[PDB]
């Protein structure tokens, strides 16, 4: 019987709190398909082929394969629009400065590599290397945007999100030094800038180590790209099934049009051909409907990917777990075959510590509440510190505000409040 997870019981008590004293910069990946292969089917070649009398028999049946061509063209233009919406979100091609020094952060793995003739970062090159004819009227149309243009959009988005923060996504691009952008991002998640500026070297080292581990993990696990591999697998196997259905008997005496024509007179040859063409039309209808359903699902996935690109990348999202586990900081997109891969950089607290807390401090018959933090106590003294980090500070009258007397709240404690 499967085990849901390890037992855990947090020591909840009436007046105790736990506050982190350290953090851990984490990088996670998320793989999203965007579009599949654009295919177009041919009516006459698939249904029977090169028999003119067969086409004469078919043309009086109706305009079914006209509808099929219409639906497949709709699917193809939908795929192109999906790619356009996901990637074409900036109207300028931003270019990184020639000297790549960003206060210790190392972006060599995700920035484009001029050494490669393909102009791709090592991560997306690994992605391309980690993802893997004869046609009877079954055409495969090429996508409008080649891989190079997609890589160009990815490079532009990366340059914009490194050089100019998130401002380029809401107007003109305004440059800003990277450490200040990262301090802004911490200030977004409720941690003051001094925490960053006193830990810039450690944060940079953790970021570099995390991105290296991500590269290695992608290089190692082959099952990570299932969400992209299965799309190609589904398309290929459906196409192969459709091809196999061509040589099916469908209840006729023979599976070959020419043999039926040669060995049989028109009286029953007409009936056999009618049965065969009806069966093949039914199979083609089934394939087209399957393609439509897959197109709807892929379009939903592409819309989700576009939302992620717009929110996690172009800005900072406060939605929980929308852009990775933990508090979101910023995300980097990466191109992939028939999809896109995100690198969510997230802030994760660690090394918690027990403390004794109180709701308010009674002093001179006045109750002082914390203004931006929480009251703690190492056992003897009382300090006020920010919620997400242990930064003890002497309680004063400028980081607290007074409200009412100290006989109405519950759990108030007695202490003094220094005045500067």
């Amino acid at each position: 019987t499967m085990s849901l997870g390890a037992e855990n019981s947090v020591a909840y008590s009436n007046n105790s709190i736990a506050i982190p004293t350290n953090f851990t910069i984490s990088v996670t990946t998320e793989i999203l398909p965007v579009s599949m292969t654009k295919t177009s089917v041919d009516c006459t070649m698939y249904i029977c082929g090169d028999s003119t009398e067969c086409s004469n028999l078919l043309l009086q049946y109706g305009s079914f394969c006209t509808q099929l061509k219409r639906a497949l063209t709709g699917i193809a233009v939908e795929q192109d629009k999906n790619t356009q919406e996901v990637f074409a979100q900036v109207k300028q091609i931003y270019k990184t400065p020639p000297i790549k020094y960003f206060g210790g952060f190392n972006f060599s793995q995700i920035l484009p590599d001029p050494s490669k003739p393909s102009k791709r970062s090592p991560i997306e090159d690994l992605l391309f290397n980690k993802v893997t004819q004869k046609f009877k009227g079954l055409t495969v149309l090429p996508p409008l945007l080649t891989d190079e243009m997609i890589a160009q959009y990815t490079s532009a988005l990366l340059a914009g999100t490194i050089t100019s923060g998130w401002t380029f996504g809401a107007g003109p691009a305004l440059q800003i030094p990277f450490p200040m952008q990262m301090a802004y991002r911490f200030n977004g998640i409720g941690v003051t800038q001094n925490v960053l500026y006193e830990n810039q070297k450690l944060i940079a080292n953790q970021f570099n180590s995390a991105i290296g581990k991500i590269q290695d993990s992608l290089s190692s696990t082959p099952s990570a790209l299932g969400k992209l591999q299965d799309v190609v697998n589904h398309n290929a196997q459906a196409l192969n099934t459709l091809v196999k259905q061509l040589s099916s008997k469908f209840g006729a005496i023979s599976s070959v049009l020419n043999d039926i024509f040669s060995r049989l007179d028109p009286p029953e040859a007409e009936v056999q051909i009618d049965r065969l063409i009806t069966g093949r039309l039914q199979s083609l209808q089934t394939y087209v409907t399957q393609q439509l359903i897959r197109a709807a699902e892929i379009r939903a996935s592409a819309n989700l990917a576009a939302t992620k690109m717009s929110e996690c990348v172009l800005g900072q999202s406060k939605r929980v777990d929308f852009c990775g586990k933990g508090y979101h900081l910023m995300s980097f997109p990466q191109s992939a075959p028939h999809g896109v891969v995100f690198l969510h950089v997230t802030y994760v607290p660690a090394q918690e510590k027990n403390f004794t807390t109180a709701p308010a401090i009674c002093h001179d018959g006045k109750a002082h509440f914390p203004r931006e933090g929480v009251f703690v106590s190492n056992g003897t003294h009382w300090f006020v510190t920010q919620r997400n980090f242990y930064e003890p500070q002497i309680i004063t009258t400028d980081n607290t505000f007074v409200s009412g007397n100290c006989d109405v709240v519950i759990g108030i404690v007695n202490n003094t409040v220094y005045d500067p």
Partner: protein
């Protein structure tokens, strides 16, 4: 225009029909049949049966 069943065609790209190269020769290939029946003995016999 015929495909759209309209007299005015809007700007864009449209699919009309298929291009096919028509074959113009026939190549029958069968072995060098060399199984001649003994009709020479049956017909060119000097003396026939009663």
């Amino acid at each position: 225009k015929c495909t759209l069943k309209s007299f005015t065609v809007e700007k864009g790209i449209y699919q009309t029909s298929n291009f096919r190269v028509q074959p113009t020769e026939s190549i029958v290939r069968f072995p060098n049949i060399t199984n001649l029946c003994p009709f020479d003995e049956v017909f060119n016999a000097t003396r026939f049966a009663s």
